[PDB]
Design brief:
Blueprint lengths: L17 H16 L20 H4 L6 H9 L6 H18 L5 H16 L10
The structure holds ligand KV9.
């Protein structure tokens, strides 16, 4: 297994906005509760799951585990930077697997709730 994505770097300033606040307090909470959240709450263990080509195909892995630690350490500059990590987490499941698989359908159901909940983030960002 490779190192997981890092959740803080001492050279990057820390910034919090009202949207990043609502993103960890509400959206993540709902997404972490979903029925199909358990395969995406931590970095994929390609060894125990016997996926030897996973990290050779997925060059930018992502999970809600690291997304949460990034919201907590203020790794993200704005809300856009966080939303981009969910899209990449979803598309990873779509790139590595084939259409119509179960894990694909679990990520699709999990994405439809994500796009629904981020429509609740404040339309005007406040620092
Ligand atoms: O397969 C899983 N659970 C059932 C199980 C059965 C037997 C032994 N061990 C576990 C599983 C999959 C992902 C997970 C998150 S993203 C992602 C992906 O993109 C492709 C795969 N695959 C490909 C083929 O299907 C099985 C595993 O898995 C994942 C994350 C997980 C999983 O279970 C344990 C913890 O987190």
């Amino acid at each position: 297994n490779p190192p997981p994505p890092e959740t803080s770097n001492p050279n990057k300033p820390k910034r919090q906005t009202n949207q990043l606040q609502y993103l960890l307090r509400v959206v993540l909470k709902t997404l972490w509760k979903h029925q199909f959240a358990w395969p995406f709450q931590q970095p994929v263990d390609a060894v125990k799951l016997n996926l030897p080509d996973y990290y050779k195909i997925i060059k930018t892995p992502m999970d809600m585990g690291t997304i949460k630690k990034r919201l907590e350490n203020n790794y993200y500059w704005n809300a856009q930077e966080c939303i981009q990590d969910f899209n990449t987490m979803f598309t990873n499941c779509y790139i590595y697997n084939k259409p119509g698989d179960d894990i694909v359908l679990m990520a699709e159901a999990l994405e439809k709730l994500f796009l629904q909940k981020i429509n609740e983030l404040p339309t005007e960002e406040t620092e």
